[PDB]
């Protein structure tokens, strides 16, 4: 509240929408894959376990 001055949020426009079907992935950089030894089949189940 700004004592009746039009509040900041209300002076500025609403922007955009939220996608109902937004996919967010669990990102894994290459440095994380160095933890595993050579020959390991790096599946999502292994990364999670």
């Amino acid at each position: 509240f700004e004592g009746g001055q039009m509040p900041l949020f209300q002076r500025l426009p609403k922007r955009g929408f939220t996608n109902i079907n937004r996919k967010e992935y669990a990102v894994v950089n290459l440095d994380k894959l160095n933890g595993f030894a050579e020959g390991t089949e790096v599946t999502p189940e292994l990364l999670l376990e």
């Binding site: 900041l8 949020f9 500025l12 426009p13 609403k14």
Partner: protein
């Protein structure tokens, strides 16, 4: 109870990587006859919430 998000603010603002608030510009609804192209080009882009305002409103977007 849980602190409620200010829903009006959640539709205007967005947190950046370093924890600043991104915002749109005002004066971007109508009356574009009365604003120069230079004004309109600059108002089109995004902006940051200022230090003084951020102090006032930071907790209203705490849950975001």
């Amino acid at each position: 109870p849980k602190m409620k998000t200010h829903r009006g603010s959640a539709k205007r603002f967005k947190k950046t990587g370093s924890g600043k608030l991104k915002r749109s510009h005002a004066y971007t609804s109508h009356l574009f006859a009365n604003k120069s192209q230079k004004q309109k080009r600059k108002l089109r882009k995004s902006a940051v919430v200022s230090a003084g305002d951020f102090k006032r409103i930071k907790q209203m977007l705490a849950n975001i």
